[PDB]
């Protein structure tokens, strides 16, 4: 098994497909930007705490909610990257 975007975003063949992938990239990038910034901020907040040096903060780091948030963020970086790769390949042609 592979991520869902692999199947949903096959090799571009038409100019319309290229524009559709662009629309999807623009939408998902704004979502990704926001999410990643938030995730990094938290990770950094702890980074500042680490520099200062607690247990509650370690738990916060392993919070399942945030942990889930971090995994969605990784999915998004991967999805966007794949779509970008697709567009570029067509663009080179």
PDB file of C-alpha atoms in Angstrom:
ATOM      1  CA  UNK A   1       0.000   0.000   0.000  1.00  0.00           C
ATOM      2  CA  UNK A   2       0.935   3.675  -0.897  1.00  0.00           C
ATOM      3  CA  UNK A   3      -0.464   7.144  -0.027  1.00  0.00           C
ATOM      4  CA  UNK A   4      -3.784   8.122  -1.667  1.00  0.00           C
ATOM      5  CA  UNK A   5      -2.301  11.052  -3.637  1.00  0.00           C
ATOM      6  CA  UNK A   6      -0.064   8.786  -5.634  1.00  0.00           C
ATOM      7  CA  UNK A   7      -3.165   7.266  -7.343  1.00  0.00           C
ATOM      8  CA  UNK A   8      -5.095  10.574  -7.374  1.00  0.00           C
ATOM      9  CA  UNK A   9      -2.234  12.531  -8.952  1.00  0.00           C
ATOM     10  CA  UNK A  10      -0.940  10.405 -11.829  1.00  0.00           C
ATOM     11  CA  UNK A  11       1.391  11.627 -14.643  1.00  0.00           C
ATOM     12  CA  UNK A  12       0.039  14.869 -16.136  1.00  0.00           C
ATOM     13  CA  UNK A  13      -1.140  14.530 -19.784  1.00  0.00           C
ATOM     14  CA  UNK A  14      -3.230  17.669 -20.531  1.00  0.00           C
ATOM     15  CA  UNK A  15      -2.918  21.424 -19.855  1.00  0.00           C
ATOM     16  CA  UNK A  16      -6.254  21.239 -17.935  1.00  0.00           C
ATOM     17  CA  UNK A  17      -4.803  18.534 -15.610  1.00  0.00           C
ATOM     18  CA  UNK A  18      -1.739  20.735 -15.020  1.00  0.00           C
ATOM     19  CA  UNK A  19      -4.027  23.659 -14.031  1.00  0.00           C
ATOM     20  CA  UNK A  20      -6.090  21.375 -11.745  1.00  0.00           C
ATOM     21  CA  UNK A  21      -2.932  20.107  -9.914  1.00  0.00           C
ATOM     22  CA  UNK A  22      -1.898  23.782  -9.568  1.00  0.00           C
ATOM     23  CA  UNK A  23      -5.276  24.660  -7.957  1.00  0.00           C
ATOM     24  CA  UNK A  24      -4.890  21.744  -5.531  1.00  0.00           C
ATOM     25  CA  UNK A  25      -1.230  22.717  -4.765  1.00  0.00           C
ATOM     26  CA  UNK A  26      -2.215  26.362  -4.001  1.00  0.00           C
ATOM     27  CA  UNK A  27      -5.054  25.233  -1.650  1.00  0.00           C
ATOM     28  CA  UNK A  28      -3.108  22.594   0.240  1.00  0.00           C
ATOM     29  CA  UNK A  29       0.010  24.787   0.492  1.00  0.00           C
ATOM     30  CA  UNK A  30      -1.810  27.482   2.476  1.00  0.00           C
ATOM     31  CA  UNK A  31      -3.200  24.799   4.851  1.00  0.00           C
ATOM     32  CA  UNK A  32       0.284  23.260   5.120  1.00  0.00           C
ATOM     33  CA  UNK A  33       1.990  26.549   5.762  1.00  0.00           C
ATOM     34  CA  UNK A  34      -0.359  27.256   8.723  1.00  0.00           C
ATOM     35  CA  UNK A  35      -0.196  23.841  10.173  1.00  0.00           C
ATOM     36  CA  UNK A  36       3.591  23.519   9.853  1.00  0.00           C
ATOM     37  CA  UNK A  37       4.187  26.939  11.429  1.00  0.00           C
ATOM     38  CA  UNK A  38       2.015  25.913  14.460  1.00  0.00           C
ATOM     39  CA  UNK A  39       3.719  22.528  14.805  1.00  0.00           C
ATOM     40  CA  UNK A  40       7.187  24.062  14.526  1.00  0.00           C
ATOM     41  CA  UNK A  41       6.254  26.756  17.088  1.00  0.00           C
ATOM     42  CA  UNK A  42       5.320  24.122  19.673  1.00  0.00           C
ATOM     43  CA  UNK A  43       8.386  22.043  18.903  1.00  0.00           C
ATOM     44  CA  UNK A  44      10.454  25.252  19.284  1.00  0.00           C
ATOM     45  CA  UNK A  45       8.684  26.322  22.533  1.00  0.00           C
ATOM     46  CA  UNK A  46      10.007  23.087  23.965  1.00  0.00           C
ATOM     47  CA  UNK A  47      13.352  23.814  22.258  1.00  0.00           C
ATOM     48  CA  UNK A  48      13.531  27.104  24.250  1.00  0.00           C
ATOM     49  CA  UNK A  49      12.619  25.165  27.405  1.00  0.00           C
ATOM     50  CA  UNK A  50      15.390  22.622  26.653  1.00  0.00           C
ATOM     51  CA  UNK A  51      17.898  25.468  26.209  1.00  0.00           C
ATOM     52  CA  UNK A  52      16.745  26.891  29.599  1.00  0.00           C
ATOM     53  CA  UNK A  53      17.448  23.446  31.098  1.00  0.00           C
ATOM     54  CA  UNK A  54       9.535  19.983  32.608  1.00  0.00           C
ATOM     55  CA  UNK A  55       7.824  16.557  32.785  1.00  0.00           C
ATOM     56  CA  UNK A  56       4.465  18.117  31.776  1.00  0.00           C
ATOM     57  CA  UNK A  57       6.230  19.670  28.753  1.00  0.00           C
ATOM     58  CA  UNK A  58       7.629  16.232  27.838  1.00  0.00           C
ATOM     59  CA  UNK A  59       4.026  14.895  28.020  1.00  0.00           C
ATOM     60  CA  UNK A  60       2.916  17.875  25.879  1.00  0.00           C
ATOM     61  CA  UNK A  61       5.571  16.808  23.334  1.00  0.00           C
ATOM     62  CA  UNK A  62       4.107  13.255  23.330  1.00  0.00           C
ATOM     63  CA  UNK A  63       0.475  14.456  23.364  1.00  0.00           C
ATOM     64  CA  UNK A  64      -1.460  12.217  20.910  1.00  0.00           C
ATOM     65  CA  UNK A  65      -3.499  15.216  19.569  1.00  0.00           C
ATOM     66  CA  UNK A  66      -0.290  17.103  18.684  1.00  0.00           C
ATOM     67  CA  UNK A  67       1.352  13.894  17.568  1.00  0.00           C
ATOM     68  CA  UNK A  68      -1.607  13.364  15.109  1.00  0.00           C
ATOM     69  CA  UNK A  69      -1.235  17.066  14.024  1.00  0.00           C
ATOM     70  CA  UNK A  70       2.479  16.422  13.315  1.00  0.00           C
ATOM     71  CA  UNK A  71       1.648  13.272  11.217  1.00  0.00           C
ATOM     72  CA  UNK A  72      -0.964  15.209   9.094  1.00  0.00           C
ATOM     73  CA  UNK A  73       1.682  17.826   8.566  1.00  0.00           C
ATOM     74  CA  UNK A  74       4.118  15.187   7.256  1.00  0.00           C
ATOM     75  CA  UNK A  75       1.370  13.795   4.955  1.00  0.00           C
ATOM     76  CA  UNK A  76       0.784  17.352   3.603  1.00  0.00           C
ATOM     77  CA  UNK A  77       4.518  18.024   2.936  1.00  0.00           C
ATOM     78  CA  UNK A  78       4.649  14.692   1.029  1.00  0.00           C
ATOM     79  CA  UNK A  79       1.391  15.256  -0.942  1.00  0.00           C
ATOM     80  CA  UNK A  80       2.528  18.767  -2.049  1.00  0.00           C
ATOM     81  CA  UNK A  81       5.994  17.596  -2.928  1.00  0.00           C
ATOM     82  CA  UNK A  82       4.541  14.796  -5.124  1.00  0.00           C
ATOM     83  CA  UNK A  83       2.152  17.207  -6.897  1.00  0.00           C
ATOM     84  CA  UNK A  84       4.995  19.705  -7.453  1.00  0.00           C
ATOM     85  CA  UNK A  85       7.156  16.884  -8.888  1.00  0.00           C
ATOM     86  CA  UNK A  86       4.306  15.917 -11.271  1.00  0.00           C
ATOM     87  CA  UNK A  87       3.817  19.466 -12.542  1.00  0.00           C
ATOM     88  CA  UNK A  88       7.536  20.017 -13.035  1.00  0.00           C
ATOM     89  CA  UNK A  89       7.920  16.779 -15.039  1.00  0.00           C
ATOM     90  CA  UNK A  90       5.149  17.942 -17.451  1.00  0.00           C
ATOM     91  CA  UNK A  91       6.700  21.467 -17.476  1.00  0.00           C
ATOM     92  CA  UNK A  92      10.128  20.033 -18.543  1.00  0.00           C
ATOM     93  CA  UNK A  93       8.341  18.235 -21.462  1.00  0.00           C
TER      94      UNK A  93
END
